[PDB]
Symmetry: none
Subunit: 142 residues, 10 copies
């Protein structure tokens, strides 16, 4: 049978230190999303440089990734990665208009506009709300 | 009809360059809605203290909670004319005395008004206990 | 009458989503009670350092320990007026000098005050040695 | 003579990793309790789904269980399991009010209210206090 | 040719000895340049309110921003004689009515003038959200 | 060793608001002085009622106090507070003649006239010069 | 011998009951003493404008400042007979023209007289910048 | 190979407290700059006394320092510290004329005037603009 | 318990400008009085048009009001406002004879003549004596 | 019996339409009453100058003040026959010479008459200092 796509997340700058000072966190706390095409293979993620999205997709293994389940996303990654040169994708720098990117993209013809947009929204790094995270909530939303 | 709610808040946040420090203890506030969709009522706080008044506070994220005893007490409390116009002693430091001297809710016993005042009272949250998996609710 | 005690604490905890990281070394603190039921006295710490003062710290979980030599030294120490009002040099870095220059406990010898100051002093715990079955007491 | 009831515990998310980083643990560390009606037979435990008690009792053998002794609990399990359809029990979802559950239960007439409550308190999963467990204590309490 | 800009400002600062206190909410103002190097135009404010007039405000630090829809609307707006001489109702409280009753920009539709008036309108900034990493732009 | 005396100041009506109006201040801006006998203990200050000195000494903790250093004043507070009933002192209402108060006082025999007068001058509330404070100067003098 | 000084002043204060409002900008004035103890000389102001004359103004609180270039220029300026009797054009609006047309200080070059006139000239102070820790000296 | 110079910054009086009062900051907020000659070794910085630069260089480890990268500055520190008695430097008190200090200095002959001046400008403490820092900007400039 | 009445004052044309000219004031300087039935609610005051009292009561929030204490006035406002249509009151234009207004009024039966007159005297705008105000006195009297 | 008093006055007021301008400095005058209820005596002023005579001035608002030294001096002064009939040199410019040459109060020393004349002397008030919270009494 065909190889299973695995979903993952990683967090950066998310440590909250408890000392006599109280609870210190870093305002750059962020959650990143990635995928593996096969078990053991490299985790793919949207590339970031200087804290901004470059528009490219890279392998980022040096990070600690945690498995997550989303049957809808696995279906969308299956379609996305069945296109030749998906890894070579170069979306507009900054990736500010996700709806326009999906609407004007001609690189994934096996994917609908609503579906590429849904996937681009999942791959998008999400800021951690520190006031919620101190209250033990994920604090993750767009 | 009657629905119970809570909201949580950091009363102080201290900023550093690219960093934030909060107190080991945050605050949990309690509120109620008389009907579905209608405004959440809560004990008013100004300058970090209880004013003694009751206000609508919708701009906050409230989460539903269940307490059959409290709903029975809110039913009695809100069946009095001018309950919203209540003005308890500033600071609300002696909850037992407030309930004992109150003549505004004659359909409520002293032990019952006191029980409700104790539920409406903001409570501190220990964030370290919270982050370890517990509710530092105090 | 006089009872000895210890308490243990992580001075730093680092939180991750659904995870916690502590230092390889935690801290053990020492205290005493003058009578059964009465408050546990301990060397005060503020901002992670020894202030030089002695305080009551009951909010902590204390475990009884036996040391006949220490009880004899606490007996001498506490039979002085204003022992609770003691204010040793901030940080309490030179325990030998503190004992040598102290004129507040004339019923105590220099070697004896120093021995007691060494017992009251917080001590680091190695958690890896602790979890292997030993007391990483240092 | 009659077959002996065996008591057991299992821990989940309780591993503490020692590295250069210090000591890392998982804040979901938990202890679960179970029983076997006969030697070799399946270990019974209160079912959990999405981290919450369903109110049902299930066999959970895929876990590593460690024997423990409690003569009072064995006496209570003896009474509990001598009722027909004990395995078919469906307590209120979440099992938040253990005192009320025992008070209103009409399924175990050979058990007193104080006794069913005592057993329900033993079967209840108990969180591991990580600050105590790092100090080599069980850290187990309600 | 046409360039968009923003500037941010604390409308109130409260001074204490060696300390300053600002409002949780600051203000963001919007402006435009007709040509590179030329003066930045913005809605005039006097006594903390919108006067209804448009002025040059160069003494402020302005940062470029991109909005292709707004540049198209400024192009239409500024191709009218005496656009700089515009005097909207004092306070500019009803932006929808201002656009509906305006007869000064016949090359602009009501929905378009209203869209532009909404962009030129000063907007409050939540500093707590700002310092946490977000733009409290409201 | 003996407990350390801490010195403090508090300011009332001292806020200067910067708006479009310019700089507004309150002409009642004033600096008050206090002392703590031990760390954590209550701050003592000369009592004021209706803007006038009553002649009494009170605890005033509800105010925000800032630590200050003055080795001469700590020496004088040490002498002052080593007298029984120092807290019970009741100087002439208004405390208009500080030199006469010190000269006629028989309550602090361990203190010289010049020394009690020096301390009374330090404890005395001092008006804030608003023209200097707008120029970023303390504006504090008698 | 020669000493430099400055003084600061609010030209307008607006009183309200129990309150005062000053302008965002105050004024800094500059002066010089020919000998230690002797009177501080400064450009005279009347009705808020520069009269063009030089006067002694001792009733003000002056603070010493160092400027080796200015002391050299004051030395040249004051070594002329009747320097105190100088009467520059009222208002002193064109400092460059004043220096260019002056025939009273032949030991001083035009660029040097102009440099000195620029130093003696009262300068506005931004109080908001001042209270933030800077000198709003302009 | 030769040991790597590390660059650092520290901030003093820079905390902004968010309460019901709004945002309070301290008008003495300041950023200081320092360097380490080797990993683990002490951070060197321009000494300040009574809020004014003394003209001397000191070790200041009791402070929390954050690493920063500047390849030009590392090159200048390399030249600066390859002179004997660089730590013993005593620049004019207050250090008011940085251009004159660099022009008249005969202590660093391996450094050009423009280069010593560039380094002196980097070592110089910089005030934090509180209006910018409340708008989430570094607010750091001369 | 019942909601607390708050007392307030506002001043118009009361600014005294200090310049080289001396002290300039406006001869229309006046003090107005108002009340709030509840905390946060609108401040009520006697309406003025063309500098003369109309005889009506209005809400005037656009003004800066300062709290004042008067236990006798709060008691009188309590009685006054416990009448239906108190806000709809229309006293004789100009309100020149306050004693006659109170004597002939049949709108406040829970109030005595001496008491309504006392309240009408408090609500009455009072001119500021500029010669006293320049001498730092309130200058307020009828 | 003897009571001390002061009164304050603007010697000049300049009127504009709907406006008034007073001098930065007003005047404080001093007076005394020999008995409770009786008329307040003060140094007479005519054409803004001191005439050298003493008059009753009741039409003014006087405020009581305490000065035990002055009451002792008024006691001596008023125990002389014809003290009210005193006619000091017009203008009263040299207070030290007036006291030195006076032969009308033989029960008073020169230093004492001079001290009293200095107290009775009208004193200027700085209104700007006054409005800032101080007494500009000079």
């Amino acid at each position: 049978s065909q190889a299973k796509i695995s979903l993952f997340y990683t967090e950066e700058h998310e440590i909250m230190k408890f000392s006599w000072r109280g609870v210190t966190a870093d305002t750059r706390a962020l959650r990143r999303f990635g995928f593996s095409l096969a078990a053991g293979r490299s985790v793919w993620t949207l590339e970031m440089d200087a804290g901004v999205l470059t528009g490219r997709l890279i392998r980022l293994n040096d990070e600690k990734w945690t498995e997550m389940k989303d049957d809808k996303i696995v279906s969308l990654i299956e379609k996305f990665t069945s296109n030749k040169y998906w890894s070579k994708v170069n979306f507009p720098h900054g990736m500010l208009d996700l709806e326009e990117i999906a609407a004007n993209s001609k690189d994934f013809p096996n994917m609908s506009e609503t579906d590429l947009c849904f996937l681009l929204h999942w791959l998008n790094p999400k800021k951690i709300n520190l006031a919620d995270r101190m209250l033990g909530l994920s604090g993750v939303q767009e």
